[PDB]
Amino acid sequence: KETAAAKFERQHMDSNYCNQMMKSRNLTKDRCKPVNTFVHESLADVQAVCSQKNVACKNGQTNCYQSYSTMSITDCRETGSSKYPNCAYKTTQANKHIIVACEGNPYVPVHFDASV
């Protein structure tokens, strides 16, 4: 069973698209997840953000880090009409800075806090 770091990778890493990938990565096989972001950068370059700019997370904890550069991301957002089993997503591609919460040793991303 998955570690938090493994779950982050299955849910967000990817070095219509959103309906296909959300199903493939087991996000919408048994529920419709409202939002999810996929990052199209190498895993090592996303893991490298845990030593970049320290910032407060949305919740006030301080183990969040913002990437110095923008990264290629796809945002998947459920339509207003979506209902399990027929989940449906609006796909938006963008190049944005990512903010991840990091934990562990090695200190690696375990939550996607935001893109900016």
Notes on the protein architecture:
The chain has 116 residues and is α+β, with helices and mostly antiparallel strands. The protein has one domain: P-30 Protein. The chain is 19% helix and 35% strand. The chain contains three helices and seven strands; from the N terminus they run H-H-E-H-E-E-E-E-E-E. It has a four-stranded antiparallel sheet. The N and C termini lie far apart (32 Å).
Query: What is the tally of helical segments?
Result: 3
Tally of separate domains: 1
How far the N terminus sits from the C terminus, by CA atoms, comes to 32 Å
Strand order of the largest sheet: 2-3-6-7
Tell me the radius of gyration: 14 Å
**Strand residues, percent:** 35-45%
Quick one: how many beta strands? 7
- Based on the coordinates given, report the CATH architecture: Roll
Summary tags:
116 residues; alpha+beta; P-30 Protein; four-stranded antiparallel beta sheet; three-stranded antiparallel beta sheet; 3 helices; 7 strands; nucleic acid binding; disulfide bond
Outline the fold blueprint.
Elements: H1 4-12, H2 17-24, E1 35-39, H3 43-47, E2 53-55, E3 64-66, E4 71-78, E5 89-96, E6 98-103, E7 108-115
Antiparallel strand pairs: 1-4, 2-3, 3-6, 4-5, 6-7
PDB class: hydrolase(phosphoric diester,rna)
Keywords: hydrolase(phosphoric diester, RNA)
Assembly: monomeric
Summarize the structure.
The protein is an alpha+beta fold.
